[PDB]
Structure formats: C-alpha cells, structure tokens
Design a protein around this ligand. Structure first.
Ligand SMILES: CSC[C@H]1O[C@@H](n2cnc3c(N)ncnc32)[C@H](O)[C@@H]1O
Ligand SMILES: CSC[C@H]1O[C@@H](n2cnc3c(N)ncnc32)[C@H](O)[C@@H]1O
Ligand SMILES: CSC[C@H]1O[C@@H](n2cnc3c(N)ncnc32)[C@H](O)[C@@H]1O
Lengths: 273, 273, 273
C-alpha cells in the first residue's frame, strides 16, 4: 500500500539470515519503509539492481542481529515483500547438520520440513472470515530449488539436493535427548529456528520461496556442542560464497516462476472457503 | 447464567464441523444467545426438538465457515453448552486418513488422540486458584461411542470402531515429512485440526463427549494431496448420511450417560487440588 | 534490585513442587518480596539458615497449590532467585514413571529432557536486542546432580542416577496414545509438567540447577491411571524423605559450583550476539 519513498517495486526478494545483515550485492540501494497491517518489518528493506533485476533485501534478524527467531514479525516481513511486487524469494539460512555427510561449509537446498515450533503466535495470515488451508505437501518452490542447485554446481560448491529441515523453537539449542529424536526418530537432515512460519506465509502469499541453507555446525554430535559464536563465525567466514551464488542466480530470475513447478503460485484457488 | 431468550435448556449438544453449518435436524428451532465469561461462542446456538429430546446445535466454524480452527473460542463454546444443561455432546468432524482401509466416505469413531497443536492459547478452564488435572487416559465417552457405532451398523454405513486422531495446528495441511511421522512413527489413524482443546474442555466440564468423524481425504498419500475444496465437497456430499445417523442416535439419549462408561462424568472428584 | 525487607541475600535456592509448599527446613525465616521486571513470583520467598548456609525457598505453585504449571510466572521466579545472589538451585518435583523399575517412592536425578510444552509464552529472558542462544546439550548442573545422588545413597534411599524427563503442557494428563509415544518412541523415563521453561531460564541466568524428582505414579500404565489426588497424596507421604535429603546436601553447598561440572555457569560467554 504506502511506501516511503513512493512507487518502489522489486521482482526478487532475498531474506538474509545469520551473518547476512547487509546486501553487499545490490547497486543503487535505496532504504524503503513499507506499511503493513502488522507493524514494523525487521528492518528497512533495501531495494537495488543486480544486473538489471530489481532486488529487495531484508535481514530477518535486523541489522546487528537484534531480533531472535521467536520475536521476528514474520507477517510484516512477508507482507512487505509481497507489497513490493516480488515473485521469487530466496532465503539464506544457517543450519545445523544431523548427518555426517552434510558437513560445515556445505550448502543444502531442502525439500521438506517438520515444524516443531510452539511460540510464534501467528502461523497464517488468515484468521477469518475467509478460512484458508493451503496445501504444503511439497512446500518449497521447485523452480527456484533447481536454479539454486544448478548455480552451486556451476560455481563448484557442494550443494546437497534434498533435505528435511526440522524447525525448533529456541532460542536455546537442543538437548542431546531432543537431537536424538530429530535424527534417529524423525530422520531429519538439518535443523534451524527461522523457517516456520516464514514459509507458511510465503506460500499463502503465492510466492515462489526456497531456502539456501549453509551448514554451520553438527548440533550436539561433535566433540563440542554448537554455540552461537561458532554459528556466526562460520557464516561470516562463508558469506562470500553465498553472495557469489546470489549474483549467479538472480539474473536468471528475470522471468516468472513456472506454474507447474511452483506448488504455492496458485495456492489460494483451492484453499479458500 | 443469562440466556436470551430466558429459560432455555437442552439435553444433547451437537457440534458441527466442516460442511455442517445448519441443523437440518431440529424442529421448533430457536436461536439462543448464552452469556459466557469468555465472550462470544462461534455463533448462535440453535435449540429445538428431535423426537422429544431437546438438542442444542452449534457450528464450531460459525455459519458460512467463518472461523478457522486456531481462532475458535473453544472455552466459550463448551461453557455455553454446559450452561444449557447438556449431558451428551456429539461432535461431527471431517478428518484425513493415514491408512488405506479408512476410506473417503467411511465414518470413524475414534478412541484416542495425540495433541500436536501449539497455538490454541487455552487448554483448560482452570488457571488457579483451584488446580485441576483431569485424567484423560481414555478421553472419549464410551457410552456414546458405542451408541454411534450401533447406529452406523443399523443404517448399513461403514463405521470404524477405533482410531487414534492426531490433532495438528494448521491452518496449513501437513508436509509429506510430517505426514510420514504421523503415520509411520506415531502410528495414528486419522488427522484433523479441531479436536483439541475442545475435548479437554468437554472432559473438564464433566460432559459425555464423542466424535463422529467422516473421512474426507487421504492426507498427502494419494495421487493428489488434500485441498480445502476437496474436504468441503466431500463433506457436503455426505452430510445426509451424518444427519441420518444423528436422527437415529439422539432419541436413544433421552437418559443419562452410564457413569461406568463415562470417564469424564466425575472427572473433577479426583482432579482438583 | 529492590527487596523488602532490604539487603537480603541467599546462596542456595530451593524450588518446591507438588506437596512442598512450606520450607519446614529453614531457621530464622523471613518472608521477602523481590522486585522483578515480570511482576509477581509465585509467592513470597522465604529466606533462612540451614547449618550456616543461607537458603531461599520458593513454592512454584504458591502456598496452597494455587498456580497450575501453565500459569506460573517462570521468568519472575528465576529472576527473583538470581537477584538474591543464589548460585545453586535445587528443584524438587513430582514425576510420573514410564518404566517399571522407576517405582513410586523412588528418587530420580534426571540428566536430560525433551520439551513437549506449547503454551508457556516465554522460553527465554532474551527477546533482543542482544540475541542469546544457550547451549543445553547437557542441561542440568553435574556438580549438583552428583551431590544429590551421593546424599541419597548415604541416607539409604533409592536414587536413579539418570533419566530423560519429557515435559508435557497439561494440565490434563496424557492419553494412552500419547504415553505410548513418550515411552516407546521417544524412550523417555519420567514425565512432568513444570521443568520447562524453568530450566531454560536457570541456564540463561548462569545458575547451577538440578532436579530431585520423586516418582509418584506410573502414568497411564497401571491398573488405574494417574489422578491428581494420588500424586499429591504420594508426595505428602514422602516429603519427610525429601526434607532429609535437603538437610544433608545443603551444608555441602557452602562453596561455589565447579565450572568444569557446570555447563551453564558461563553460558553467556559464547551464547550472546
Ligand atoms: C547465530 S546462532 C542462532 C541461529 O542458528 C541457527 N542454527 C544453526 N545451527 C543450529 C542448530 N544446531 N540448531 C538450531 N538452530 C541452529 C538458527 O536458525 C538460529 O537463528
Ligand atoms: C474444510 S478444509 C479444513 C478442515 O479439514 C479438516 N481435515 C480434513 N482433512 C484433514 C487433513 N488431511 N489434515 C488435517 N485436517 C484435515 C480439519 O479439521 C479442518 O478444519
Ligand atoms: C499434583 S498433580 C500435578 C502435578 O503432577 C506432576 N506429574 C506427576 N505425575 C505426572 C504424570 N504422570 N504426567 C505428568 N505430570 C505428572 C506434574 O508435574 C504436575 O504439576
């Protein structure tokens, strides 16, 4: 609805996670305020050009990592991106690994998730009177997944092509007994705190959303358990590789997602009562 | 406490789920407002006669399916039914199946549940200073379960005589990875969104509550995953069968539940500290 | 910050659970009000002497068991203990058993937990702008665990030396289908309602916290399922044994926890961003 400055539009949105507070990537950056019915997004959205494509960057934790996962205004964030006209959303996230072969420094492009959050307050945009139940069997946008995998391959980085993300509430990390459940019982591959309800809202807004995850740690399974400082250090050390992948992929997103490879692109057709 | 019109009482309550917004079933219908300490119930309660038994009908989603599962005022709904004097509560619900032999169009009368909700805000009526911990090992009222099973048999419908209901938060449906957990790990039979905390509150109010579930879909396991429109279509197509079962069962509920086959009928005796 | 009376300090904190509303244990008891940014703790804190060590006792449910698990102001409780200067926290709790050999009347000193709560509203003290993710792989303080185990042995009581606690939301007890999940799928040992988020907050405050649990029931697995009255009766019958253990252990806590056996004692060093 209202933006300041007025008239700003973008085509691709990038949501930065741990370690990614600035868009080193955009040219001609303008900071934009976007009105939402839910109040403030995490920070200003930075809009600029990447090889002729207009990109909107939002740090989910705000600049300086000021907002922990449970306190993020997920509704405002996704509303603001949708209001700017974006069709594609790339999320860049730090995750823990629950398997030896998904190693620190590897990328993962997950294809499934399990929601073990509890305190996020709103899991939908739709509280009535139109009841909306989106289908999320295949919750990520395949068109964008495949493009991230291809970019990673071309640049020579390791990119695991599948993975189930278990989303936990936090902010504490898991106990050993919990980690054993995630790994041995649920057979999840990676773990983080921020995917839900971000992905649910992206789907409801009919966006093509995918996650580019970077493994930062092995959860409770190494000699030393994960610490926050380790996650941050690992991300900051590798942010250059994530930036290179974004510069590779974004120019290829000049067009529209293919409907047959975008499960949420027409989610509301069959979902609203 | 206060009702408008004044003096209205009922013996059986029916909570209608998806597809069941009107009580085609009652005669001499009066719309009733019932005061509750929790504000508005989902809609007016309709009170009328079914073969000499006074029945109170409440659509949990409101008329026109205006209230999604996470936004229902469960406390107000159950308080209002209790205030009218009801002893028996039949819930009619749409569920998904996690097993091939529980097929779309079949009825299920579940005997257990697993609560995987997270955002329902109140799971009890008792916040102190009297602490109440009801026993819910066998959470449904057996007297009423057995009567529903018998009615279904007599009318010639398929009624599965047991089943564990996994209650999920929604409003989105499950991912494939989540559905695999419900089915393969938890070994649940059916899935829905509305049972909790409705059943907890019914037990605390010492009501005899049972669910008549209708299978509308196979969750994420068919060629096509579940959509909201499919659930609604399937329910509306079969609502006649549900109405026939209610007309059969309600006249047999002229009496009181048998205490030895009503786990919650004296729940508060041993539960309050 | 502000206390009334002013100037009160304590070294050991004891949080009493079900059945333990008074500190039969302390001498020279003074009731203390401690300001917190979160409002009222469960009750006054009672401060007094046990063989030369200053002890602060707080009943988590308040006197008279007025506050059920979901309504406890966990932040206020832990803030108030920290403000008084305590370094050690002993929690005394009633738990259910999920295994035949952990019998009613036995003590358990758990070493792990699984959090299955959903409605506790705040799981941390840190909502930003400093983001804090504490490591809780080994969530209890080992120094204090070992001292409780030793005391139990010396007095001749059965004390199980390990156990995974599954924390459920309540206030209703588990269904049979849920209990089967806790026992057979998650392989938990004991069950209760109060550990989370108490333990998370204790860790964030850099306290040495451990639980002395008493088994009061076998959950849904005996001839009769658990009832609230049974739990209370069993605790009140055995509170003398718990008091004897506290009198044995507290004089040995005159010193400081050993850092190498206190996982949370420097939790914030690596946890804050
Ligand atoms: C900066 S440390 C906190 C961040 O770590 C991410 N994360 C990385 N490793 C893990 C892990 N092992 N478990 C949970 N979240 C993790 C979470 O999404 C969170 O926002
Ligand atoms: C009208 S579509 C939404 C309703 O479908 C019911 N339901 C039917 N099938 C499923 C399913 N597969 N998973 C979850 N809830 C379902 C839920 O209880 C909800 O209120
Ligand atoms: C006084 S009855 C309620 C208390 O029982 C404790 N508890 C004892 N047995 C169990 C059990 N089987 N399941 C859950 N909590 C239990 C809980 O922590 C709660 O505060």
């Amino acid at each position: 609805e209202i933006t300041r400055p007025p008239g700003v539009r973008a085509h691709v949105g990038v949501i930065g996670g741990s370690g990614l507070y600035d868009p080193g990537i955009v040219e001609n950056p303008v900071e934009v305020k976007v009105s939402t019915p839910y109040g403030n997004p995490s920070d200003f959205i930075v809009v600029g050009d990447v090889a002729g494509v207009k990109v909107a960057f939002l740090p989910r934790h705000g600049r300086g990592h000021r907002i922990p996962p449970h306190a993020i205004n997920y509704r405002a964030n996704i509303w603001a991106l949708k209001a700017l006209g974006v069709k594609w959303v790339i999320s860049v996230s730090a995750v823990g690994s629950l398997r030896e072969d998904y190693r620190p420094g590897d990328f993962v492009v997950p294809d499934q998730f399990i929601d073990m959050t509890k305190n996020r307050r709103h899991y939908t945009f739709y509280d009535g009177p139109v009841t909306v139940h989106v289908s999320m069997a295949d919750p990520f946008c395949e068109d964008l997944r495949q493009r991230l995998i291809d970019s990673g391959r071309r640049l020579g980085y390791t990119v695991h092509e599948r993975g189930t993300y278990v989303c936990i509430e936090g902010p504490r990390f898991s106990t050993r007994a919990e980690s054993r459940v995630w790994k041995d019982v649920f057979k999840a591959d990676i773990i983080g705190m921020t995917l839900v309800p971000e992905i649910n809202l992206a789907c409801e807004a009919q966006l093509c959303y995918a996650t580019l995850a970077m493994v930062t740690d092995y959860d409770v399974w190494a000699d030393r358990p994960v610490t926050a400082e380790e996650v941050e250090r690992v991300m900051i050390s590798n942010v250059e590789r994530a930036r290179r992948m974004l510069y590779d992929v974004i120019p290829k997103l000049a067009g529209e997602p293919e409907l047959e490879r975008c499960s949420c692109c027409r989610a509301l057709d069959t979902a609203a009562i």
